[PDB]
Design a protein around this ligand. Structure first.
Ligand SMILES: CCCCCCC(=O)CCCCCCCCC(=O)O
Ligand SMILES: CCCCCCC(=O)CCCCCCCCC(=O)O
Lengths: 108, 110
């Protein structure tokens, strides 16, 4: 009946200082936003530092949801908490973010 | 995070049309009994293929390879270049697709 959903968000930063501020902020606050996202059916999150694209400061973040309802619930949470929050938005003002939303086709 | 971090690669595969993309998904699914066993024996923890639906009119999957560590990643690249590189065949399939890979270290996971 129910496909799984996974999102890949690539965050690109001007320099190391900016990326390190983001990473530290994400890690430090995880105890709150992870609890909330898991209560809504996030299965797993990961942050991944890109190493094969030269001198860039780039992470890929992965969000693995149980199903559509979890995906939708977690989008609403992230909008409310971060996307619509001008103080957070200012924290990453010169960063570029781009997300690919996916249906899981095959996993082994 | 870890002294010996996990490694993860994300390959994005783009196709000209739906036919070409499903021919690829099917190929990857059908040959899995060979390659999955081989990669896991070299430290692949997990593989996934993911259809991207939010980029409008594109035909595109993201493939994720989750490795135990740097050595496992390296053994797996070795295996793949040995195998699919020097068994083409595979080369002709991937010939109309465009592939781009982002290779990473895991900073945090939960
Ligand atoms: C204080 C800020 C640190 C906390 C940030 C937590 C976090 O998960 C980053 C928000 C990025 C939003 C983009 C993700 C898109 C989600 C999706 O499409 O599934
Ligand atoms: C065309 C079918 C033959 C077998 C293909 C097996 C498969 O897993 C797809 C390989 C696509 C190339 C991606 C290799 C990247 C691995 C990495 O960087 O970690």
């Amino acid at each position: 009946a129910e496909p799984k959903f996974t999102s890949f968000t690539t965050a690109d930063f001007i320099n190391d200082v900016d990326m390190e501020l983001f990473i530290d902020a994400v890690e430090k606050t995880a105890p709150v936003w992870v609890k909330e996202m898991k209560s809504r059916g996030l299965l797993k999150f990961s942050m991944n530092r890109v190493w094969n694209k030269g001198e860039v400061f780039r992470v890929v973040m992965t969000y693995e949801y149980k199903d559509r309802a979890s995906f939708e619930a977690n989008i609403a949470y992230l909008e409310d908490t971060f996307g619509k929050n001008p103080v957070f938005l200012q924290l990453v003002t010169t960063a570029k973010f781009t997300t690919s939303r996916c249906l899981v086709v095959m996993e082994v």
